[PDB]
């Protein structure tokens, strides 16, 4: 607890002639901005606030930056002598004082700069939570006041998703254990969750101090010197024209791999006690997939790095699009492929694959439980002077954190739950047990297996919510195809009634989407609080401001009253 | 030009005992708010601004009301001694000073209050426009500066719609005069127009002084005294449950009428020089429909009056919904009915109608040209002391204006153009000639056949834009059904390929909708002006504000520079 706000590491990289100049320049710009540049430690350096008036000036800088771009409607007009938040406002002000333009040499000569852990309160909220599995609102704000409120939005999303997943758990175990009633209640759950999270997010953002942030950062990677400060928008189209055919080739390669798996399945089942040993290649490729997901993930990361698609913000949107199409193809091409191809078209294809009905209900089980089984049984087959500077050198020798990976995995959970639940309605209890175990794992790995993130200021949880909605829509179409297609087992396809079912069910989905969104727009949150406060300030300012041709030969009050009296008496003289 | 801002009429209605008291109360509240209450005329009364400082106070009241609810980001802080607009700002301030709460007895004892006409400049912009048929931007702002900018949005919308309708005019006459290429270019036009009008509206609102207005007025008709100021939201559902079955009964009645027309058509064509005389009942009911539209219009007006659906704003949205469903059923149930029923199902139905192919291409012609023919040939078969107080009594003895009726008729134009153009591609040249004639008719009837409206402040043209989008979408589905259905004439229906065409074409419509909207979001308007001004004020305020533990035994600048020098030399001693 040495009152150190950030550390800044430096790498002494090549030979030591210019580093004195560059270190002096870093220190120069630093002391121009932030005093009490501490280097009692060694390579790295420390910072903290110089004087409380200077801290007050930097706070007022940040407040003017906030009101200048839209957040916090009221102006910051006084020298605002109020006590800040716990550490969120303080660390955010200091990070903005280091990061913003008008601040580091060679643009990446220094490596990552980071605060240090409050290991006391961190351990308190670690070992406070072997209990009750539902983090209440005060403890949620405790999670806000350290490491920002972006991480607060993440944890509130994950906990709310657990809370709404436990209803299809009970219902999908309560399928007396494929019928159409479960498909209808599945889509209703699937759409209620997204709209409820939209209004919950709008409530909880205004409950904290972010009404809505759209301050575009400028990630200094894009580069085209053309005018006074510019890259032309044309090479974007060339590189999206790179984006599409590689994704198509990835789809083709995955289809080839899974077709090889089905041909080997056929060969083993023809040659040969050993039914699971027959079905093994599906299990092997299902366990092999979540490595291929990260492989294509870093491939698409290199593709988006090649594209410099935005300076900063729509870089994230483009990256979420790449992750969604890669993740979608590599985790939903096998089931869609095997259902919509190998179940109606068996006898026309398996003669080509040489030298069965209701495979699908076993396909989905293996393909959605295998990765969890491997990741759960790995944790069982594996067992059976300067004196806190060493702690700092522990903390620096540590990996960095990304929110995106766990949230991607949650989007996978949602996609298997929505795109085809009624094939095997123990999908929700499986997912419930998985995140039932992995809850504390997530909080542990964000609290001590990585350093702190610097506190961001984000309102939304990103494009994942729009990808959630789109995935729900596609799930509506595909569920409506399947449950008509395989109900009641000499069969028939009857290709108009299936396509009519697709059409009619999609538009019923869309009208229920509109109806539930307009219903929950009416049902207000407890935002009545932070809107009524605005109403009082509104009314107070208004009541403040309500204080402090030769023929106009007729007088205003008395003449006009007597004239009107004369006119109505004249009119009623009949 | 007697500097009179508004007149206020009074009706002396029943017998004359309380009217002295009520007139004195009206005059009392008036002189408390607005002096120079002039009644040199008689029943009615005049008003004008009392003193220029008092006018300045009322202006500052209005400015605080504007900045208090969001419009005009900057505060109105000084005693703003600036000259106003021509008459728009002035009349709006005075009308708000009369109308707002914290102002008329019995809530409707006085009748309508209204400004007077600037017949000089009115006549100038009348007889300025026998020319060029495209009202330029300066003359458009001349239309803004009298009778508000809501009417400016209306005229800009109508002129922009004419400008984009003249392209399918040329193209639909250029169909070498039903093919699929015209359907594709129809839907592309149909969607380009809506997105272009969205960005044109966002440009032109910020070019005037309405960024966005959502100040909810309180139309004092709804009434439930429950708490301090409330009607419960439950009877809304009861009255929407009234809304639906009456619309269904109207659809049933129209279907019965048009079925009677087809049976009579069959009887005449069976009994009997006289082919048009055979087809007469279609023509008669087509001419009879635009009266039934106004009949059901005032019926739905009474239904929405029965519902008090909002206090003020969503009353307009509910009324636009009623007008759209009534107008849609009474002008598109006949064509959809006759195509999708009587063309595939003829031989199964005309034996029931007792005691033909390609009817449709004649049906649509009669049904879309008949009303225009009647309304155009009617104007040919018909020919072959106080001294300006009389002018005021001309102006008061005059009807009121509603924007909604002509805009409804335009939505009909758009619906026939979008829902099924390729049946007969002379629909655009017909509509072009109709509004080519009716342009000056619209401006004349708004300028001298009615009194002035008081200047409203509206941003959008209402829910008509959303109803335009929805109508385009339904038009995409129905065009894709028809042009597959009747192409190349022993035929077949092939009920999967039609339904596949419906599905696939609807989703191609939706992806082109998303693509063109994200494209035109990138192509900026000349809003660069009124955003760069905000950028300069932003930067100016920022550059204003950028002006005016026992171990910290180490000095900031020199000690740290020497220590870092010692450390890198120590490191490079190898």
Q: What is the 3-state secondary structure (H, E, C) of A462-524?
A: CCHHHHHHHHHHHHHHHHHHHHHHCCCCCCCCCHHHHHHHHHHHHHHHHHHHHHHHHHHHHCC
Contact A552 B65 (CB under 8 A): no
Provide the H-helix boundaries in B382-488.
389-396, 404-419, 427-447, 464-485
Shortest CB distance from B24 goes to which of A35, A545, A561? A561
**CA B38 to CA B8: how far, in whole Å?**
11
Contact B64 A503 (CB under 8 A): no
Q: Which residue(s) pair with B8 in the sheet?
A: B45, B113
For residues A112, A115, A119, A123, the Cα torsion angle rounded to the nearest 10 degrees is: -80
Using alpha carbons only, how large is chain B's radius of gyration in Å?
Answer: 31
DSSP letters spanning B370-399: HHHHHHHHHHHHTT---SSHHHHHHHHSS-
Chain A hits for B60, Cβ within 8 Å: 545
For residue B13, the chain A residue with the least C-alpha distance is A568
Select from A568, A570, A573 the residue whose CB has the most chain B CBs within 10 Å, as the one to mutate to test that interface.
Answer: A568
**CA B286 to CA B282: how far, in whole Å?**
6
Chain B closest-CA separation from residue A530 CA (Å)? 16
B120 marked among binding-site residues: no
Provide the H-helix boundaries in B5-114.
19-33, 52-68, 88-99
Contacts of B97-105 with C-beta under 8 Å, sequence gap 24+, read B97/B33, B97/B34, B97/B58, B97/B61, B98/B6, B98/B8, B98/B33, B98/B34, B98/B47, B101/B218, B102/A546, B103/B29, B103/B33, B104/B26, B105/B22, B105/B25, B105/B26
Q: Which residue has the tokens 């109608």?
A: B353
Helix (H, G, I), strand (E, B) or coil at A241: helix
Chain B hits for A541, Cβ within 8 Å: 64, 68
Is residue A216 a contact partner of residue B535, using CB atoms and an 8 Å limit?
no
Chain B hits for A20, Cβ within 8 Å: 561, 564-565, 568
Shortest CB distance from A20 goes to which of B15, B16, B568? B568
**CA B115 to CA B149: how far, in whole Å?**
16
In the numeric block, which tokens belong to residue A469?
């909605």
H-helix or E-strand spanning residue A67: helix A52-68
Chain B hits for A551, Cβ within 8 Å: 2, 40
H-helix or E-strand spanning residue B235: helix B235-271
For residue A24, the chain B residue with the least C-alpha distance is B561
For residue B33, the chain A residue with the least C-alpha distance is A546
Shortest CB distance from B27 goes to which of A39, A502, A560? A560
Chain A closest-CA separation from residue B107 CA (Å)? 20
For residue B523, the chain A residue with the least C-alpha distance is A233
H-helix or E-strand spanning residue A334: helix A313-337
**CA A34 to CA B67: how far, in whole Å?**
38
The domains of chain A are located at: 1-574
**CA A99 to CA A122: how far, in whole Å?**
26
Contact B43 A563 (CB under 8 A): no
Closest CA to B330 of B360, B300, B374, B361: B300
Contact B556 A31 (CB under 8 A): yes
For residue A573, the chain B residue with the least C-alpha distance is B16
Is residue A223 a contact partner of residue A231, using CB atoms and an 8 Å limit?
yes
A379 marked among binding-site residues: yes
Provide the H-helix boundaries in A208-279.
235-271, 275-278
In the sheet with B44-47, reading across from the earlier edge strand, the strands are B44-47, B6-9, B113-114
Contact B36 A556 (CB under 8 A): yes
**CA B119 to CA B214: how far, in whole Å?**
33
Chain B hits for A69, Cβ within 8 Å: 538
**CA B527 to CA B530: how far, in whole Å?**
5
Chain B closest-CA separation from residue A60 CA (Å)? 9
Q: To 10 degrees, what angle do helices A495-522 and B495-522 make?
A: 40
Contact A568 B64 (CB under 8 A): no
Chain A closest-CA separation from residue B554 CA (Å)? 6
Angle at A207 between CA A202 and CA A211, to 5 degrees: 55
Shortest CB distance from B552 goes to which of A19, A40, A572? A40
**CA A107 to CA A103: how far, in whole Å?**
8
Q: To 10 degrees, what angle do helices B280-305 and B235-271 make?
A: 170
A442 marked among binding-site residues: yes
Select from A27, A54, A466, A499 the residue whose CB has the most chain B CBs within 10 Å, as the one to mutate to test that interface.
Answer: A499
- Angstrom CA distances, A451 to A39, A398, A399, A406, A526, stand at 21, 7, 7, 17, 35
Closest CA to B457 of B243, B81, B148, B113: B148
Chain A closest-CA separation from residue B499 CA (Å)? 7
Contact B560 A522 (CB under 8 A): no
How many helices (H) and strands (E) would you count in chain B? 19, 3
For residue B4, the chain A residue with the least C-alpha distance is A549
Is residue A104 a contact partner of residue A10, using CB atoms and an 8 Å limit?
no
Backbone angles phi, psi at A44, to 5 degrees: -160, -170
Is residue A158 a contact partner of residue A442, using CB atoms and an 8 Å limit?
yes
Backbone angles phi, psi at B44, to 5 degrees: -160, -170
Residue B301: partners with Cβ closer than 8 Å, 6 or more residues away: B319, B322
Helix (H, G, I), strand (E, B) or coil at B113: strand
A16 marked among binding-site residues: no
Chain B hits for A556, Cβ within 8 Å: 31, 35-37
Is residue A461 a contact partner of residue A317, using CB atoms and an 8 Å limit?
no
Contact B45 A560 (CB under 8 A): yes
**Cα–chain center distance at A64:** 28
For residue B58, the chain A residue with the least C-alpha distance is A546
Experimental method: cryo-EM
Shortest CB distance from A556 goes to which of B37, B60, B551? B37
Exposure on the CB side of residue A2, measured as CA atoms within 13 A: 21
Helix (H, G, I), strand (E, B) or coil at A46: strand
Sign of the Cα pseudo-torsion (B434, B440, B445, B446, in order): positive
Shortest CB distance from A569 goes to which of B16, B38, B69? B16
Chain A and chain B share a number of CB contacts under 8 A equal to 136
Chain A hits for B18, Cβ within 8 Å: none
In the numeric block, which tokens belong to residue A139?
């403890």
Chain A hits for B561, Cβ within 8 Å: 20, 23-24, 27
For residue B540, the chain A residue with the least C-alpha distance is A68
Residue A240: partners with Cβ closer than 8 Å, 6 or more residues away: A307
In the numeric block, which tokens belong to residue B223?
């009434």
Contact A16 B572 (CB under 8 A): yes
Shortest CB distance from B496 goes to which of A12, A64, A495? A495
Shortest CB distance from A556 goes to which of B35, B551, B552? B35
What is the structure's resolution, reported in angstroms to one decimal?
3.9
Chain B closest-CA separation from residue A266 CA (Å)? 33
Select from A35, A100, A545, A547 the residue whose CB has the most chain B CBs within 10 Å, as the one to mutate to test that interface.
Answer: A545
Select from A62, A560, A573 the residue whose CB has the most chain B CBs within 10 Å, as the one to mutate to test that interface.
Answer: A560
Is residue B24 a contact partner of residue B31, using CB atoms and an 8 Å limit?
no
Closest CA to B475 of B186, B166, B165: B186
H-helix or E-strand spanning residue B114: strand B113-114
Backbone angles phi, psi at B382, to 5 degrees: -80, -50
Backbone dihedral region of A464: left (phi > 0), alpha (psi from -120 to 50 degrees) or beta?
Answer: alpha
Closest CA to B38 of B5, B12, B10: B5
Is residue A216 a contact partner of residue A313, using CB atoms and an 8 Å limit?
yes
B409 marked among binding-site residues: yes
Contact B503 A500 (CB under 8 A): no
In the numeric block, which tokens belong to residue A500?
């009519």
Chain A hits for B522, Cβ within 8 Å: 233
Closest CA to B347 of B337, B357, B335: B357
Closest CA to A30 of A115, A108, A98: A98
Is residue B498 a contact partner of residue B355, using CB atoms and an 8 Å limit?
no
Chain A hits for B43, Cβ within 8 Å: 564, 567-568, 571
Is residue A35 a contact partner of residue A386, using CB atoms and an 8 Å limit?
no
Chain B hits for A45, Cβ within 8 Å: 560
């Amino acid at each position: 607890n040495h009152h150190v706000d950030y550390v800044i590491r430096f790498n002494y990289g090549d030979i030591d002639t210019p580093e004195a100049i560059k270190k002096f320049e870093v220190l120069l710009l630093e002391l121009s901005e932030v005093g009490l540049q501490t280097e009692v430690r060694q390579l790295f350096v420390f910072v903290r606030a110089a004087s409380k008036k200077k801290l007050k000036r930097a706070v007022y800088q940040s407040r003017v930056r906030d009101w200048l771009y839209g957040v916090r409607n009221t102006e910051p007009e006084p020298a605002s002598s109020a006590k800040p938040q716990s550490e969120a406002e303080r660390l955010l002000v200091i990070y903005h004082l280091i990061t913003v333009p008008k601040r580091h040499g060679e643009w990446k000569n220094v490596d990552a700069i980071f605060p240090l852990h409050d290991e006391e309160t961190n351990r308190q909220c670690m070992r406070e939570w072997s209990k009750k599995t539902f983090l209440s609102t005060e403890d949620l704000d405790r999670i806000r006041n350290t490491f920002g409120e972006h991480v607060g939005f993440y944890f509130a999303f994950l906990q709310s998703y657990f809370r709404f997943l436990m209803f299809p758990a009970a219902f999908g175990f309560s399928c007396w254990l494929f019928s159409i009633i479960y498909t209808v209640v599945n889509c209703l759950w699937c759409i209620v969750f997204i709209e409820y999270w939209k209004r919950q997010e709008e409530d909880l953002s205004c409950r904290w101090q972010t009404k809505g942030v759209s301050a575009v950062h400028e990630k200094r990677a894009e580069f085209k010197p053309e005018k006074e400060i510019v890259f032309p928008a044309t090479k974007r189209m060339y590189r999206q024209l790179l984006q599409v055919p590689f994704a198509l080739l990835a789809a083709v390669a995955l289809g080839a791999i899974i077709a090889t798996c089905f041909a080997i399945e056929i060969f083993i089942s023809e040659v040969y006690l050993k039914g699971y040993l027959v079905f093994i290649p599906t299990i092997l490729v299902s366990a092999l997939i979540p490595t291929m997901s990260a492989v294509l993930l870093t491939v698409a990361t290199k593709l988006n790095d090649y594209e410099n698609y935005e300076t900063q913000d729509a870089y994230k949107v483009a990256l979420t699009q790449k992750i969604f199409v890669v993740n979608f193809i590599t985790s939903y091409l096998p089931i869609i492929l095997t259902a919509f191809v190998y179940v109606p078209f068996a006898s026309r294809i398996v003669p080509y694959l040489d030298v069965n009905p209701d495979r699908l209900r076993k396909q989905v089980i293996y393909f959605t439980v295998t990765a969890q089984i491997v990741g759960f049984a790995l944790e069982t087959i594996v067992p059976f002077e300067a004196r806190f500077l060493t702690r700092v050198r522990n903390e620096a020798e540590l990996e960095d954190y990304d929110v995106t990976d766990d949230l991607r995995e949650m989007c996978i959970q949602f996609g298997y739950l929505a795109l085809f639940s009624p094939v095997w309605p123990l999908v929700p209890v499986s997912f419930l047990i998985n995140n039932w175990v992995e809850l504390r794992s997530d909080f542990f790995k964000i609290c001590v297996e990585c350093k702190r993130p610097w506190p961001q200021r984000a309102d939304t949880i990103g494009p994942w919510l729009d990808s959630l909605g789109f995935l729900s829509w596609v799930g509506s179409i595909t569920s409506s195809a399947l449950v008509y297609m395989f109900s009641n087992g000499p069969t028939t396809i009857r290709c108009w009634a299936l396509l009519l079912t697709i059409f009619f069910s999609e538009h019923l989905y869309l009208i229920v989407r509109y109806a539930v969104r307009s219903a929950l727009a009416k049902l207000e949150p407890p935002n009545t609080r932070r809107e009524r406060i605005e109403r009082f300030m509104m009314r107070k300012r208004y009541l403040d401001t309500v204080l402090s041709r030769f023929w106009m030969r007729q007088r205003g009050w008395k003449e006009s009253a007597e004239v009107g009296l004369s006119l109505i008496t004249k009119a009623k003289g009949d």
